Amino acid sequence: SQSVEIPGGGTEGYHVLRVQENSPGHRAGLEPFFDFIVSINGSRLNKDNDTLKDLLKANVEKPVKMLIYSSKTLELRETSVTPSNLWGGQGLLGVSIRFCSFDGANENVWHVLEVESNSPAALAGLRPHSDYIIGADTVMNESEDLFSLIETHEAKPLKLYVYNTDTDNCREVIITPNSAWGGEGDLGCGIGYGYLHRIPTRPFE
Ligand SMILES: [K+]
């Protein structure tokens, strides 16, 4: 429970799924997958409503303070964002968000271990040790969920989003499970899960 305390309480906020290039969101340093918008100018975003939308519009072209919780670092931070209509893309922030809880979010990751040569994993470009699977086309909330998807994608392309500790960013991976492949399992990579196999929490010193 030794979790950073959230000003205004609770564990819900706005999960950043996507950040458009050169958006106000990108300039403020929002990272997809890991960041939850917790508050804006001190107003706690603990309800799925229009307060964020409305406070951005009110402050168009002006800077605004945001509190952000990261499921990567497990820390809160404050950042400045300037909502804008003048950058070419869609939205004042340029982000897609889903209102949900960040509680336990840092547990939902599957660490890529060794990757056997020429396996479905290698063909997809999964990288040993440095890659962590963190999402898919559907939500993945339980240890089993990655494997449920693998099992139902026998001989089918399965999209995964993967974080890499060398690049410190996430990328789309297409893998095709193949139980006939003639090395171990369906993937031909080991997968680590749980306390010792979460994202390293200090990408920067
Ligand atoms: K096999």
Residue whose pair of structure tokens reads 């950042």 in the numeric block: 79
Q: How far is the CA of 187 from the centre of ligand 1 (A)?
A: 8
Q: How far is the CA of 181 from the centre of ligand 1 (A)?
A: 4
SS3 content of the chain, % helix, strand, coil (to 5): 15, 30, 55
Contacts of 58 (CB under 8 A, 6+ apart): none
Method by which the model was determined: X-ray
Which among 91, 38, 90, 46 is positioned nearest to 67, based on CA atoms?
38
User: Are 199 and 109 a contacting pair, CB within 8 Å?
Assistant: yes
Give the pair of three-digit tokens for residue 26.
């990108």
Q: What is the resolution of this structure in A?
A: 1.9
Q: For residue 140, how far is the Cα from the chain centroid? A: 11
**Cα torsion 47, 50, 53, 55: sign:** negative
Give the burial class of 76: count Cβ atoms within 10 A of its Cβ; 0-12 exposed, 13-18 middle, 19 or more buried. Answer: middle
Q: How far is the CA of 188 from the centre of ligand 1 (A)?
A: 7
- Sketch out the chain's domains with CATH numbers: 1-107 (2.30.42.10), 108-205 (2.30.42.10)
Give the pair of three-digit tokens for residue 144.
């089993």
Residue type, 165: T
Which among 76, 138, 133, 75 is positioned nearest to 108, based on CA atoms?
133
Query: How many other C-beta atoms can be found within 10 angstroms of the C-beta atom of residue 24?
Result: 28
Q: How far is the CA of 147 from the centre of ligand 1 (A)?
A: 15
Q: How far is the CA of 150 from the centre of ligand 1 (A)?
A: 13
Which among 174, 169, 147 is positioned nearest to 159, based on CA atoms?
174
Q: How far is the CA of 161 from the centre of ligand 1 (A)?
A: 23
Give the pair of three-digit tokens for residue 164.
């890499």
Q: How far is the CA of 116 from the centre of ligand 1 (A)?
A: 11
